[PDB]
Design a protein around this ligand. Structure first.
Ligand code: FAD
Ligand code: EPH
Ligand code: HEM
Ligand code: SLI
Ligand code: SF4
Ligand code: F3S
Ligand code: FES
Lengths: 138, 239, 613, 102
């Protein structure tokens, strides 16, 4: 019996059976390293949606960009609400960027101990807030 | 007198249309060993002999008792019970596995994946084997520390979300660390083709460095770091 | 019985056991072209041999210069002259070849200055036939040598088309007219029953450490092969010989390796004195396992215990350099912290003599063939082999030498395959078993599945384990042994009264542990009765009414004009044990030890002598 | 064997560092040339990113097919859209600049 055959017999057995899956997300303990990886996917997906919506609307929608800015100027009567737009835009970008560096450092083989994950993770978190508040006011 | 509560995942395949449920047991800790397995054995022996689980060494080297205690994958024989009585220990089978019965998961696929990397020494000329001990220097040997110790308890792989969603085609940290174990063993002559085996999008490349594996290994090993070290060899080996 | 699906399997050879011995025999058979099935109740890596720690003895001569004949001498001297010298010759000569074989397989042995296999000083061993001091021949993978031995063996076994029956609990031997035809097994995964038939069967199921209340062995060391042999009406051997390892942890009774002492670790009493200097002047705390552990048990009696209840003794390590402890013993460094809350680098480990190894087992050739006893003569059981701790080629005799069992495994696992490969051919006629054979095993299974009695499985196991612990301990006397005997016998009648709860098919552990209990009891009965009959002190078996080592001659003085004692007037012989499965009666016999080696010219017979370290 | 997955992985990290370099470079030097390279680096990295998400979650035969083609469409449309924006409008750099001093 080969390794490839053992896998086919594993799947043919268990799918055609009434065996339940043991719970996974429902039961598993949340850790900072873990929560931060999901965020990197989330921020990734969100930032792609941003770029794609911005690009497609440069093809599907009429009028120039400055024309569309005059449309944002019209709606608004709010001062700090513009900052909230800027903070909400820049927040996911900064997060993904910093944590991206952390990912690239990992790919080099460095910083892969559990204590280091907590440290590097916290430094990323603190760096996001600062550069997000930092950029929002420009 | 000192009662501690345990919430255990139960399922009996022999009962007509039984579905998975939790069951509570209560144990005086003054008549019990310090480890979780001690409790499991005690409730098995004294309260409910319908409780089914894998165990052998009670020492943390066989890897039989791997399960999910309080949201983390470890060895029951090695995790001591939280003496805090107000809390209730939640015992679960290893995540995203098919449950044969109670806390006993079907590890058949896991074992097969181990088989598919050829976990043994390979030489280009094996006609001289069994007569001369192969030479390996102290330093060449240190490279195997933190890799050979692996118990195959399956705690790590079974905690990797990539291994949940893609357990069929993704090998997982346990098996991956072992391929690395043989890659850097100086006595092995098949390093390049061992790396060439991982040349697809699923076998190695479903790792996205979630690092739950290293965080959960009952033996203190670092499978994710070994994975990272593979990814590097994969990009740098020529021909 | 029509309520059970019976699946028939056809093989050239069956190996029962996927331990070290099991595997080596298993794939050794397939490597020689045999269509082999390996039947195991655990996944092969889970087998006890992972627990192994100390190492694997071979006279490689990597530290100082060595000779396998010196290793020979040490083993027979260790065996207290109950060791069969023909088997000991074969083993100690093969030792290097077998170990090299493993290193070539991939075993990650610790390394030396030269880059060769690192060898360790260990309890019982010497150079120049006792004269030349301490020997360094324990090959090791740091602290975890058994773990690695088992993994590389399992790893290797994947290269051949051996048919593994993983998590299958073998019930009985398929016996027909004095010949073995295979095994009947319960598939744990779905409750089905499998008759696996073969021309040859290899019983390699390891020891029965779980007959006692405190032991280093696993929950699965339940002597399942021994019980199979007993129920076949075949004899067992030297079952009273139970090794108490000197250094088991005080708490859960986990093994702390003899390697600690071999590296320079010391045994201490409540006074601070290295007490093993008072019991053995020459070898000190590196003496025989029976000598050391009995010295410990004695120090406790005098009032020199160590705990708040004064019942144990300290293993001191904190005097060895920290870097040595890290490279040599990281695995006990872990479990001392985990189980006793002890930093080895600062404090000593609480240690205690606890049950460890079974030198007794299934009687065997140096070729690994199971022997029955007919008319005071040895006879080979056709198609039946046994190796490892389950067996008794008596390579160990009355006391096993440290780091010799992992050797035993690899050497005799190999031997079993060779004895088969060289006697018959693959594809030979596999003998057809009777239509309804192995019936009584199934009927036993069914009655144990619905057992509606008064005493529950766990409670009877405890009664047995505690009773063996107090009646067949390190020291044993006539009175206490006799009370132990009729006590174990009473608990055998109690098997009728056992209560079982789980009435399912899939993974009925409640049921299997009850099969395990029947198995353990048969091992217990034979151990305790054989023990009370033996009226001498030899090896691990020490009597306090008969402390004399009783041989054919008085071997203290010259051999000349001595009256040689008749066979049934001395105790330098193997204890053969039978139990009538029904009444639970133990009737015993004896066969001689083997003194002649395989070749006198290459390895001279070592006659009995004054035995102390 | 042909080392396709390892090259792909390397390529991913190479454009990651490229994109990391380009954000400071775009701020310090906002120009026509930086606009296009920011469009290429941006859409590519995002395409390969969504690639992985599809690979992980899209269980199926003809579904793995569609999702991959569907992404390829959306990506191509995205990169064109950006290039159009660079050519016939103020381009990414200046466009952000205006948005921010709002
Ligand atoms: C207990 C112990 C022993 C030990 C040691 C450390 C510990 C904690 N360290 C050693 C060392 O460093 N050097 C050395 O030479 N010996 C050491 N020992 C002793 C030695 O390891 C043991 O004697 C040896 O492990 C015995 O191995 P063996 O191959 O004979 O078998 P096993 O390891 O006990 O495994 C048993 C196998 O048989 C199968 N089995 C058992 N019963 C059944 C039934 N019912 N049906 C089907 N299969 C069965 C098990 O599944 C297992 O595979
Ligand atoms: C796809 C793009 C879609 C547009 C929306 C996304 C905008 C998010 C980017 C925020 C970056 C902060 C920029 C801060 C700023 O005002 O730049 C300075 C600007 C003022 O002049 P100045 O030269 O500073 O003036 C000096 C006079 N004192 O001049 C610049 O240097 C602008 C260059 C910035 C390039 C960054 C592009 C990154 C695109 C990420 C898209 C994320 C989507 C979600
Ligand atoms: C210059 C700053 C950026 C850096 C350094 C960076 C880096 C990375 C890295 C290294 C990964 C892979 C991480 C892993 O191994 O799992 C990743 C994922 C991803 N990135 Fe970025 N990125 C940046 C900006 C962006 C932007 C602007 C977008 C918007 C299109 C984006 C979209 C994505 C997406 C969709 C993923 C997929 C998440 C996944 O791999 O599961 N990134 N990024
Ligand atoms: O971080 C997760 N995934 C992931 C995938 C790719 C890159 C980064 C993170 C993750 C963590 C917990 C549960 C589900 C998930 O998908
Ligand atoms: S790396 Fe750790 S968790 Fe994974 S199989 Fe090995 S011991 Fe188990
Ligand atoms: S938990 Fe995971 S995805 Fe990789 S880093 Fe460990 S295997
Ligand atoms: S039972 Fe051996 S690891 Fe827990």
């Amino acid at each position: 019996t080969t390794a490839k055959e053992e896998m086919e017999r594993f799947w043919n057995k268990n799918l055609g059976s009434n065996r339940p899956l043991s719970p996974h997300i429902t039961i598993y303990r949340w850790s900072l390293p873990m929560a931060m990886s999901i965020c990197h996917r989330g921020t990734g997906i969100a930032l792609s949606a941003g770029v794609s919506l911005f690009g497609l609307s440069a093809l599907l929608l009429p009028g120039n960009f400055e024309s569309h800015l005059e449309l944002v100027k019209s709606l608004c009567l709010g001062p700090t609400l513009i900052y909230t737009a800027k903070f909400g835009i820049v927040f996911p970008l900064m997060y993904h960027t910093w944590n991206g560096i952390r990912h690239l450092i990992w790919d080099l083989g460095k910083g892969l101990t559990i204590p280091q994950l907590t440290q590097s993770g916290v430094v990323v978190l603190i760096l996001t807030v600062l550069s997000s508040v930092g950029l929002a006011a420009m | 007198p000192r009662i501690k509560k345990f919430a255990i995942y139960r399922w009996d395949p022999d009962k007509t249309g039984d579905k998975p449920h939790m069951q509570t047991y209560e144990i005086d800790l003054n008549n019990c060993g310090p480890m979780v397995l001690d409790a499991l054995i005690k409730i098995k022996n004294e309260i409910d002999s319908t409780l089914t689980f894998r165990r052998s060494c009670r020492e943390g080297i066989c890897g039989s008792c791997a399960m999910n205690i309080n949201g983390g994958n470890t060895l029951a024989c090695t995790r001591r019970i939280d003496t805090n009585l107000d809390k209730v220990s939640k015992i679960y089978p290893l995540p995203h596995m098919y449950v044969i019965k109670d806390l006993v998961p079907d590890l058949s696929n896991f074992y097969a994946q181990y088989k598919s990397i050829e976990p043994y020494l390979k030489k280009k000329d094996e006609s001289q084997e069994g007569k001369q001990q192969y030479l390996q220097s102290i330093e060449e040997r240190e490279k195997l520390d933190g890799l050979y110790e692996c118990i195959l308890c399956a705690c790590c792989s079974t905690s990797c979300p990539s291994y949940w969603w893609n357990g069929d085609k993704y090998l997982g940290p346990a098996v991956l660390m072992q391929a690395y174990r043989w890659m850097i063993d100086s006595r092995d002559d098949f390093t390049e083709e061992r790396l060439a085996k991982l040349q697809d999008p699923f076998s190695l490349y479903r790792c996205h460095t979630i690092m739950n594996c290293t965080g959960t290994c009952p033996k203190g090993l670092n499978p994710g770091k070994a994975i990272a070290e593979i990814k590097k060899m994969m990009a740098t080996y020529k021909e | 019985s029509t309520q059970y699906p019976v699946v028939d399997h056809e093989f050239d050879a069956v190996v029962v056991g996927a331990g070290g011995a099991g595997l080596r025999a298993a794939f050794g058979l397939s490597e020689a072209g045999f269509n082999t099935a390996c039947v195991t109740k655990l996944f092969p890596t889970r087998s006890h041999t992972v627990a192994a720690q100390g190492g694997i003895n071979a006279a490689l001569g990597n530290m100082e210069e060595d000779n396998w004949r010196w290793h020979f001498y040490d083993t027979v001297k260790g065996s207290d002259w109950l060791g069969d010298q023909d088997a000991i010759h074969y083993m100690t000569e093969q030792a290097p070849a077998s170990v090299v074989e493993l290193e070539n397989y991939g075993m990650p042995f610790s390394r030396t200055e030269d880059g060769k296999i690192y060898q360790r000083a260990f309890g019982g061993q010497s150079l120049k036939f006792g004269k030349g001091g301490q020997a360094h021949r324990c090959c090791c993978v740091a602290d975890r040598t058994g773990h690695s031995l088992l993994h590389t063996l399992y790893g290797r076994s994947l290269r051949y088309d051996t048919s593994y029956f993983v998590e299958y609990f073998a019930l009985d031997l398929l016996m027909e007219n004095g010949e073995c035809r295979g095994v009947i097994a319960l598939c744990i995964e779905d409750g089905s029953i499998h008759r696996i038939r073969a021309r040859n069967t290899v019983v390699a199921t390891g020891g029965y450490g779980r007959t006692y209340f405190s032991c280093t062995s696993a929950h699965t060391s339940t002597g399942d092969g021994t019980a199979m042999v007993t129920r076949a009406g075949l004899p067992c051997q030297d079952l009273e010989f139970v090794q108490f390892h000197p250094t088991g942890i005080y708490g859960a009774g986990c093994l702390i390796t003899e390697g600690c002492r071999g590296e320079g670790g010391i045994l201490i009493n409540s006074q601070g004195e290295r007490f093993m200097e008072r019991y053995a002047p020459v070898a000190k705390d590196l003496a025989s396992r029976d000598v050391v552990s009995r010295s410990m048990t004695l120090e406790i009696r005098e009032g020199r215990g160590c705990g708040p209840e004064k019942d144990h003794v300290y293993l001191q390590l904190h005097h060895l350099p920290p870097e040595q402890l890290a490279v040599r013993l990281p695995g006990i460094s872990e479990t001392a912290m985990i189980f006793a809350g002890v930093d080895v680098t600062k404090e000593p480990i609480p240690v205690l003599p606890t049950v460890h190894y079974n030198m007794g087992g299934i009687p065997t050739n140096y070729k690994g063939q199971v022997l029955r006893h007919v008319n005071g003569q040895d006879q080979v059981v056709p198609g039946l082999y046994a190796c490892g701790e389950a067996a008794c080629a008596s390579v160990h005799g009355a006391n096993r030498l440290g780091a010799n069992s992992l050797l035993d495994l690899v050497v005799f696992g190999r031997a079993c395959a060779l004895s088969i490969a060289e006697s018959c051919r693959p594809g030979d006629k596999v003998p057809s078993i009777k239509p309804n054979a192995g019936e009584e095993s199934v009927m036993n299974l069914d009655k144990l599945r619905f057992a509606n009695g008064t005493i529950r499985t766990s409670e009877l196991r405890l009664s047995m384990q505690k009773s063996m612990q107090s009646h067949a301990a390190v020291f044993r006397v006539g009175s206490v042994l006799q009370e132990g005997c009729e006590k174990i016998l009473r608990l055998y009648g109690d098997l009728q009264h056992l209560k079982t709860f789980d009435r399912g098919m899939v993974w009925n552990t409640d049921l299997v542990e009850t099969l395990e209990l029947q198995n353990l009891m048969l091992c217990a009965l034979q151990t305790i009765y054989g023990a009370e009959a033996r009226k001498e002190s030899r090896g691990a078996h020490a009597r306090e009414d008969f402390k004399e080592r009783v041989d054919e001659y008085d071997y203290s003085k010259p051999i000349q004009g001595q009256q040689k004692k008749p066979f049934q007037e001395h105790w330098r012989k193997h204890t053969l044990s039978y139990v009538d499965v029904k009444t639970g009666k133990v009737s015993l016999e004896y066969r001689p030890v083997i003194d002649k080696t395989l070749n006198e010219a290459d390895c001279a017979t070592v006659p009995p002598a004054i035995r102390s370290y | 064997s042909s080392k396709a997955a390892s090259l792909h992985w390397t390529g991913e990290r190479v454009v990651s560092v490229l994109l990391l370099g380009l954000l400071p470079a775009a701020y310090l030097n906002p120009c026509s040339a930086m606009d296009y390279s920011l469009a290429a680096a941006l859409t590519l990295h995002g395409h390969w990113g969504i690639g992985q998400v599809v690979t992980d979650y899209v269980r199926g035969d003809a579904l793995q097919k569609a999702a991959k083609a569907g992404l390829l469409a959306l990506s191509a449309f995205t990169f064109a859209g950006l290039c159009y924006f660079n050519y016939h409008d103020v381009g990414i750099c200046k466009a952000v600049a205006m948005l921010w001093k709002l």
